[PDB]
């Protein structure tokens, strides 16, 4: 899922 | 136009925890797809295009563990989502592509 954290 | 499902929204953002900048950047989402943080954006949900604002998302609606994800948003822009955005269940760059996954 975003963010891409 | 408002943020609500099937619309693709670019936001602007900042993310911090615990008073600390994560991560910043500008994203565009397919909204009411579950692509995005549910608690963010369940924030987002009509939401005007031009609107800044802050969200507090808790871990158990999203990094050390229950700590509360802050977040400053800026709604940039709202869009409708075409055909190919919908039946992929995602948004797609502004440049039309046709491809599948
Ligand atoms: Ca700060
Ligand atoms: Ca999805
Ligand atoms: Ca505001
Ligand atoms: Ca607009
Ligand atoms: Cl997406
Ligand atoms: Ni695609």
Redesign the pocket.
Same mark, same amino acid.
């Given at each position: 899922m975003?963010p891409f954290i | 136009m408002k943020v609500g499902q099937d619309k693709?929204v670019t936001i602007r953002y900042t993310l911090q925890v615990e008073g600390e900048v994560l991560d910043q950047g500008e994203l565009?989402?397919?909204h009411g #797809?579950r692509?995005?943080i549910p608690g963010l954006e369940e924030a987002l949900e009509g939401r005007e295009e031009g609107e800044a604002f802050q969200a507090h998302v808790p871990a158990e609606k999203a990094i050390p563990p229950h700590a509360t994800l802050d977040f400053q948003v800026e709604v940039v822009k709202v869009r409708e989502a075409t055909p190919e955005?919908l039946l992929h269940? #995602?948004?797609h760059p502004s440049g039309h592509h046709h491809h599948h996954h």
């Open positions: 975003k | 693709v565009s989402y397919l #797809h692509n995005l955005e269940g #995602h948004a």
